[PDB]
Design an enzyme around this catalytic site. Structure first.
Site, PDB file in Angstrom:
ATOM      1  N   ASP A 160      -0.819  12.135  19.198  1.00 55.11           N
ATOM      2  CA  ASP A 160       0.117  11.456  20.076  1.00 55.11           C
ATOM      3  C   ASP A 160       1.178  12.455  20.558  1.00 55.11           C
ATOM      4  O   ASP A 160       1.775  13.158  19.753  1.00 55.11           O
ATOM      5  CB  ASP A 160       0.748  10.320  19.271  1.00 55.11           C
ATOM      6  CG  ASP A 160       1.832   9.623  20.011  1.00 55.11           C
ATOM      7  OD1 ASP A 160       2.901  10.227  20.204  1.00 55.11           O
ATOM      8  OD2 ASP A 160       1.605   8.468  20.402  1.00 55.11           O
ATOM      9  N   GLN A 189      14.063  34.059   1.253  1.00 57.26           N
ATOM     10  CA  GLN A 189      14.049  34.926   0.091  1.00 57.26           C
ATOM     11  C   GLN A 189      14.306  36.386   0.415  1.00 57.26           C
ATOM     12  O   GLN A 189      13.908  36.883   1.477  1.00 57.26           O
ATOM     13  CB  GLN A 189      12.711  34.785  -0.619  1.00 57.26           C
ATOM     14  CG  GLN A 189      12.695  35.270  -2.064  1.00 57.26           C
ATOM     15  CD  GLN A 189      11.405  34.860  -2.774  1.00 57.26           C
ATOM     16  OE1 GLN A 189      10.779  33.861  -2.412  1.00 57.26           O
ATOM     17  NE2 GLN A 189      11.007  35.627  -3.786  1.00 57.26           N
ATOM     18  N   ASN A 217      -4.758  16.834  20.052  1.00 58.94           N
ATOM     19  CA  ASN A 217      -5.272  15.480  20.035  1.00 58.94           C
ATOM     20  C   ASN A 217      -4.410  14.491  19.278  1.00 58.94           C
ATOM     21  O   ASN A 217      -4.883  13.437  18.871  1.00 58.94           O
ATOM     22  CB  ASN A 217      -6.691  15.479  19.481  1.00 58.94           C
ATOM     23  CG  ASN A 217      -7.596  16.440  20.230  1.00 58.94           C
ATOM     24  OD1 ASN A 217      -7.607  16.456  21.464  1.00 58.94           O
ATOM     25  ND2 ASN A 217      -8.352  17.251  19.490  1.00 58.94           N
ATOM     26  N   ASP A 263       5.524  16.151  19.363  1.00 59.23           N
ATOM     27  CA  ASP A 263       6.851  16.653  19.689  1.00 59.23           C
ATOM     28  C   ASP A 263       7.834  16.514  18.539  1.00 59.23           C
ATOM     29  O   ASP A 263       8.684  17.382  18.333  1.00 59.23           O
ATOM     30  CB  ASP A 263       7.406  15.930  20.920  1.00 59.23           C
ATOM     31  CG  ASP A 263       8.686  16.568  21.437  1.00 59.23           C
ATOM     32  OD1 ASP A 263       8.596  17.660  22.047  1.00 59.23           O
ATOM     33  OD2 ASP A 263       9.776  15.989  21.218  1.00 59.23           O
ATOM     34  N   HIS A 282       3.576  31.078  -6.100  1.00 59.32           N
ATOM     35  CA  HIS A 282       4.771  31.062  -5.271  1.00 59.32           C
ATOM     36  C   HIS A 282       5.257  29.629  -5.042  1.00 59.32           C
ATOM     37  O   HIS A 282       4.474  28.746  -4.679  1.00 59.32           O
ATOM     38  CB  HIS A 282       4.415  31.736  -3.940  1.00 59.32           C
ATOM     39  CG  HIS A 282       5.565  31.878  -2.998  1.00 59.32           C
ATOM     40  ND1 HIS A 282       6.725  32.531  -3.336  1.00 59.32           N
ATOM     41  CD2 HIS A 282       5.707  31.502  -1.705  1.00 59.32           C
ATOM     42  CE1 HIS A 282       7.534  32.558  -2.292  1.00 59.32           C
ATOM     43  NE2 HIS A 282       6.938  31.942  -1.288  1.00 59.32           N
ATOM     44  N   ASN A 338       7.449  27.658   2.934  1.00 60.90           N
ATOM     45  CA  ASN A 338       7.414  28.871   2.140  1.00 60.90           C
ATOM     46  C   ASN A 338       8.870  29.384   2.156  1.00 60.90           C
ATOM     47  O   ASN A 338       9.419  29.653   3.223  1.00 60.90           O
ATOM     48  CB  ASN A 338       6.476  29.872   2.829  1.00 60.90           C
ATOM     49  CG  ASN A 338       6.446  31.212   2.147  1.00 60.90           C
ATOM     50  OD1 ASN A 338       7.371  31.569   1.431  1.00 60.90           O
ATOM     51  ND2 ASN A 338       5.381  31.984   2.388  1.00 60.90           N
TER      52      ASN A 338
END
Ligand SMILES: [Ca+2]
Ligand SMILES: [Ca+2]
Length: 321
Positions: A286, A77, A284, A291, A240, A264
């Protein structure tokens, strides 16, 4: 095939200009004060101070229509209250087929360039093809309104301009409903949810909608009047429009947690609670899921547990195709 907006024929105009060695100048939405706004962006408003109109080819040596794909991070924005529209465009980028209809790929500032671009929008019951010349509002050498995180990418700025065009001006985009943009990008229909009185299977509804490619948005209601875009202590923004961009259940400490991802449209200012980018919850989960899902980046996108999402947001919109 889409109807030509105002009878404007993209291919014809482009060919005509390309052959006349000239660049397109849109008479239906010229680079003039009225195209910027009427009040807060009116001819004699200080907000328009220093705003000039320039084509990307006048700003950079090699501007690009699309860079590394047309994705949600290309929606950041600017100085305009069109969060609703931007959240819709960011959500749109997740539906590959609809994205490619609204945003004709293959348009470039190089081969076949004549200063004209076009986009498809669903308007009042029909798909219409809207053209714009590529003159964009610039200030201090930067796009004033929407811009991509990538400074040399212009597809989103051009789409916003096309949307401004059908609305008569950029100012006309200030303030709106994400539902309206969702529908104008899909021809679908939006169903809204009051999160405080939502179905017990809402999370499943969200999962299925995302998988189908529906567009989802959410927001926090503002009952304080002028707390429009007020940032909460946990850095969520009220009144918003957010794009709901994902949902996945993860193996956490050996357990299964329902997460929801949102973005956002500012492209920054993110939730700081549980599941936020640098939160400890991720340690904590996997290693693979962490990833695949967690990206440590101030890009406006973040994860929240569905519980926190239901506690912090007040409404959800799902536009199904
Ligand atoms: Ca991009
Ligand atoms: Ca982030």
């Amino acid at each position: 095939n889409a109807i030509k907006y105002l009878g404007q024929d993209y291919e014809q105009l482009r060919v005509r200009c390309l052959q006349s060695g000239t660049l397109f100048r849109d008479e239906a939405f010229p680079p003039v004060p009225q195209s910027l706004g009427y009040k807060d962006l009116g001819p004699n408003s200080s907000k328009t101070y220093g705003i000039k109109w320039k084509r990307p080819t006048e700003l950079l040596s090699n501007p690009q229509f699309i860079v590394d794909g047309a994705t949600r991070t290309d929606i950041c924005q600017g100085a305009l209250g069109d969060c609703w529209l931007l959240a819709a465009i960011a959500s749109l980028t997740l539906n590959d087929t609809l994205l490619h209809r609204v945003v004709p790929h293959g348009q470039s500032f190089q081969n076949g360039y004549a200063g004209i671009f076009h986009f498809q929008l669903w308007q009042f019951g029909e798909w219409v093809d809207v053209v714009v010349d590529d003159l964009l509002p610039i200030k201090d050498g930067k796009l004033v309104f929407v811009h991509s995180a990538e400074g040399n990418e212009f597809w989103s700025a051009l789409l916003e301009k096309a949307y401004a065009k059908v609305n008569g001006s950029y100012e006309a985009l200030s303030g709106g409903s994400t539902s309206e943009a969702f529908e104008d990008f899909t021809g679908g229909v939006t169903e809204w949810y009051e999160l405080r009185k939502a179905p017990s299977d809402l999370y499943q509804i969200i999962l299925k909608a995302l998988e189908r490619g529906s567009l989802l948005g959410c927001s926090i209601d503002i009952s304080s009047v002028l707390d429009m875009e007020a940032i909460t202590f946990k850095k969520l923004v009220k009144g918003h429009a957010y794009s709901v961009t994902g949902a996945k259940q993860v193996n956490y400490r050996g357990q299964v947690v329902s997460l929801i991802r949102m973005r956002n449209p500012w492209g920054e200012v993110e939730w700081t609670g549980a599941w936020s980018d640098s939160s400890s919850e991720w340690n904590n989960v996997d290693p693979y899921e962490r990833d695949q899902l967690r990206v440590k980046m101030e890009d406006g996108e973040f994860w929240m547990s569905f519980r926190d999402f239901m506690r912090e947001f007040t409404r959800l919109e799902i536009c199904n195709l």
